[PDB]
Design a protein around this ligand. Structure first.
Ligand SMILES: OCCNC(=S)NC1CCCCCC1
Length: 209
């Protein structure tokens, strides 16, 4: 059972901007996703200080980067606080409203796309390299859900039937045909060292066999 929702007008405008403009410095998407994962891990770790039972769904706090040349996907996995159904559908997009408007004002005040993180909307930089993004997420207070969008103004949310995650979020990037360099080991390493050398959680690169 799948529900289809329309993106808020300003978010749909940002994604169409991100997809259609010519911007060569596409590697910043990984920094933004890793920084988002760091925030999610900070939140569960902070909450667990007053409630250790919040870690019953997993004590490990880490980030895994998993390229797959066969499927042409790059997957970013964190064991952070995860996302509820209301987060996926309403609350997060409501908070991103002001940032998207301001980010688009800044895009005419000099700023470029690489500053997307300073407006709290860095996640949508995934569409610099991805034609489709799938988000599997599990929050302690909700079921496992699957969010998906190929942009174009709509996204879907459904209960996920696949492998249970425990807790956290999995961002699956279905890369565009010309963006397969982000499946390469030495390319991901160079990006992580340059942009995320100061993340307070272990970032593990899964190399393919
Ligand atoms: O970082 C930018 C703000 N977006 C966040 S925090 N999360 C996104 C995940 C996909 C579905 C929920 C809402 C959008």
């Amino acid at each position: 059972e799948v529900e289809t929702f329309a993106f808020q007008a300003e978010i749909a405008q940002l994604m169409s901007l991100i997809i259609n403009t010519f911007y060569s410095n596409k590697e910043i998407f990984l920094r933004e996703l890793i920084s988002n994962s760091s925030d999610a891990l900070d939140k569960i770790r902070y909450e667990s200080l007053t409630d250790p039972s919040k870690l019953d769904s997993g004590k490990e706090l880490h980030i895994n980067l998993i390229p797959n040349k066969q499927d042409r996907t790059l997957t970013i996995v964190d064991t952070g606080i995860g996302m509820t159904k209301a987060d996926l559908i309403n609350n997060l997009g409501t908070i991103a409203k002001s940032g998207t408007k301001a980010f688009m004002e800044a895009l005419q005040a000099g700023a470029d796309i690489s500053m997307i993180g300073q407006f709290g909307v860095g996640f949508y930089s995934a569409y610099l390299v991805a034609e489709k993004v799938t988000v599997i997420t599990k929050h302690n207070d909700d079921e496992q859900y699957a969010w998906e969008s190929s942009a174009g103004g709509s996204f879907t949310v459904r209960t996920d039937t696949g492998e249970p995650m425990g807790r956290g979020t999995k961002v699956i990037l279905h890369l565009k045909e010309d963006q397969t360099e982000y499946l390469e080991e030495r390319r991901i390493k160079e990006i992580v060292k340059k942009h995320s050398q100061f993340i307070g959680y272990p970032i593990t690169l899964f190399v393919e066999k």
